[PDB]
Amino acid sequence: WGPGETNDSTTVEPVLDGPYQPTTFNPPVDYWMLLAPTAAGVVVEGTN
Amino acid sequence: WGPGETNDSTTVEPVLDGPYQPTTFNPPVDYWMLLAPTAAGVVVEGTNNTDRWLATILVEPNVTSETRSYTLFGTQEQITIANASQTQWKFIDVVKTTQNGSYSQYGPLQSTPKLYAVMKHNGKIYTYNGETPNVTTKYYSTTNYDSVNMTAFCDFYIIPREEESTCTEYINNGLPPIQNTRAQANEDIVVSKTSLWKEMQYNRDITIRFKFASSIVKSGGLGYKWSEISFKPANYQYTYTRDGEEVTAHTTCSVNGMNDFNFNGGSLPTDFVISRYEVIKENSYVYVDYWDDSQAFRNMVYVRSLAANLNSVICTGGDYSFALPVGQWPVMTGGAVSLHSAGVTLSTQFTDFVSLNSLRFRFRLTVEEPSF
Amino acid sequence: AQANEDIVVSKTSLWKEMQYNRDITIRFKFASSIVKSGGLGYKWSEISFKPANYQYTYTRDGEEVTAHTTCSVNGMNDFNFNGGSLPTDFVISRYEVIKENSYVYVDYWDDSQAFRNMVYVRSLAANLNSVICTGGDYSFALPVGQWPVMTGGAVSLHSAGVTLSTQFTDFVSLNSLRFRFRLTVEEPSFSITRTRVSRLYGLPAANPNNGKEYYEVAGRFSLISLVPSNDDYQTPITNSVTVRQDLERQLGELREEFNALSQEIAMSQLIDLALLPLDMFSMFSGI
Amino acid sequence: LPVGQWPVMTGGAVSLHSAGVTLSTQFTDFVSLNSLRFRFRLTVEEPSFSITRTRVSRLYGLPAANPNNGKEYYEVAGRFSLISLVPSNDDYQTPIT
Amino acid sequence: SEISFKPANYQYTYTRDGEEVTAHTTCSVNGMNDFNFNGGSLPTDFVIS
């Protein structure tokens, strides 16, 4: 005695946080922002 | 006989398509666009770029016929706005019909929730307008209504047309409130006198045929996202002959330990997003509940031992096509899994004077090429 | 090979059908899995149920019984809150709540002789009382701002029968008794603060324990089973406490009796007997 | 057993009653010893031995499994009377052995 | 296969009329009943030959 067959769900990360959109915010310290622009011109701005 | 206790799930929609941040996009036909701006000024703009330009501006209560600088389609302009509300906020529509064309005012909508609703349909632009809690709908004439984009500078939801009722009350009152929260002892009794039993070893061929079943739930909205791609208990029935005796059999396939992959193609309503789809790997098993009418399964109530020797099988991945409204259809394909009999189980459940038995062959899995 | 063959592994056994009525006090505690999605931390990837093991001891009828319980759920509903695509927005990718369309399995096993007699089981009934499993208070620790809290959530459990599973491996046989409880939604409703998702009925996986170390349901369980009893009727013919040979007689009584018999003797017949040469056979045959 | 409940052999009892004593020999490595061999008749007693996990109960005797029941030894106290014939050719001597 | 008796030797010392006497004994048994348990023909079942 005596456990039985049981519900079991394993979660797998996608591999990336997800392709996010262009918008304004202040990402937390100790985190990298990786831009992948499609067209030339301005891509990223940083203003304190 | 004979289904076993099988894995089950139920995916409940969030209630809305979700707050999609303010970004430029072109919603398809027959989809209501709802906006709940946080700040006054320009909130939503709809442009066909050839002969129709529309915009909505949210004005605070107690605003005289004053001029303010607003950015429409990228150009600053001294737009004039008037208001007489005390407690409400005024949504004012502004229209023009050329790149250099003059501007005009139409509307308005004096509402408390700061919620506006627009849509396109059959060469018309529908908008919720009037007064609460008795709001009405209005239609604006135009050409090439399908070419109009709708770029919003404030967070906006998308709703299907069929749920316009929920849209209507959503203009009666804002989106659901943020809620702003803070006898005894032991007895044994013989029910039947001494019985008489024996022990028998039945060896029989088993040719178990099981087929998977896939549950496909697509998230509401435009239709570029799928809410769930899961496995489902798959029933099957058949017949086969052994030793000259015909026997009918029933089978029920299911999975356990499945891995949930969740690809994200972006939050734009037109991006291909899979909220959650299930794939079986090294750390997953596939159960097959089998039962027939042979003499053996009649004599399987009181079982002292069961040993199954089965030949492994390879299950490939089929071709499924996602029917996106526009673009190119993604197709899931590939993936081969080899099954190995990792023992058997006998599950019995009781109800009054009737019991349900189930012979569950559990197969462990090994991944092999081709990939998926 | 192919075709059919049946071989008798053991001859006619001897079994009897018994019915054991015993009080069972099942205690069970939930367990939650909290997988936070990689990133800023404002989004939680999974708030799910996980099988929860527990061990305890209780006394019934003056006997101490140690029991083990394993709580799990089935048919749970997956709610998902989508608070925005910004990395700073609060999002719950998938969290599980149990409703009318959900069951909670409780796999129970102890060391009482009834369970030892439970292998070949004919019928099982479990008169069990209902319990109100509430939801605790779990705080989502965001990097900044007010921490959202999941609170509330209660559900009533009712005895929806019992299952007995037996999985065979090599030559061992793992058994498992499974009390499956069906669920009824009732107040208070649960909700997560600083969000529009509120007044939903169920018991979310955030804190099913609610501080309580174990949810208890007591009752009676009746097990009509078949077991190995010969009814003390398979033993050796002579098996018993050694039969006592009773005391015979004190010799004085015997002298009295023989002297009393002395007057019953006929003289002619006595002398006639007193000429037969009584040998060993003659004297010891007539006794 | 590595699997399932562990059967236990409990119970079992017999009374040893003295019945007869004779001469016997103990075989050592390099000498042989004269010894007294006592017979004991067995009488079954109330404790009945049974094996758990089995259809065995109300069996009487003393199995060989654990007949000592943890006791260091089984003890009987009594007296033996011996009369020995010692070779003697005079009334004043008497051999010790 | 078997669970049976075996003769056993013992040594000790005890007092007799003030004499510490060292004693040696050897216990054996005869006329025994060979019971048996046969759980089944499988290698799994409890069997006492």
Curated annotation (Swiss-Prot), chain B:
Keyword Transcription regulation: no
GO BP: permeabilization of host organelle membrane involved in viral entry into host cell; virion attachment to host cell
Region described as Spike body and stalk (antigen domain): spans on this chain: 183-372
Site features described as Binding to sialic acid, chain residue numbers: R52, S141
Superkingdom of source: Viruses
UniProt keyword list: Capsid protein, Coiled coil, Disulfide bond, Hemagglutinin, Host cell membrane, Host cytoplasm, Host cytoskeleton, Host endoplasmic reticulum, Host membrane, Host-virus interaction, Membrane, Outer capsid protein, Viral attachment to host cell, Viral penetration into host cytoplasm, Viral penetration via permeabilization of host membrane, Virion, Virus entry into host cell
Hydrophobic as annotated region, ranges: 324-344
GO cellular component, one term: host cytoskeleton
Record's keyword annotation contains Signal: no
Location of the region described as Spike head in the Swiss-Prot/TrEMBL record: 16-175
Effect seen on changing S141A: Reduced ability to bind sialic acid
Motif (DGE motif): 243-245
Disulfide bonds: C154-C167, C253-C315
TM ranges: none
Family in the record: Belongs to the rotavirus VP4 family.
Anything else known: In group A rotaviruses, VP4 defines the P serotype. Some rotavirus strains are neuraminidase-sensitive and require sialic acid to attach to the cell surface. Some rotavirus strains are integrin-dependent. Some rotavirus strains depend on ganglioside for their entry into the host cell. Hsp70 also seems to be involved in the entry of some strains.
Protein's UniProt name: Outer capsid protein VP4
Organism of origin: Rotavirus A (strain RVA/Monkey/United States/RRV/1975/G3P5B[3]) (RV-A)
The organism's taxonomic lineage, starting at the top: Viruses, Riboviria, Orthornavirae, Duplornaviricota, Resentoviricetes
Full-length numbering of the shown residues: 50 to 437 of 776
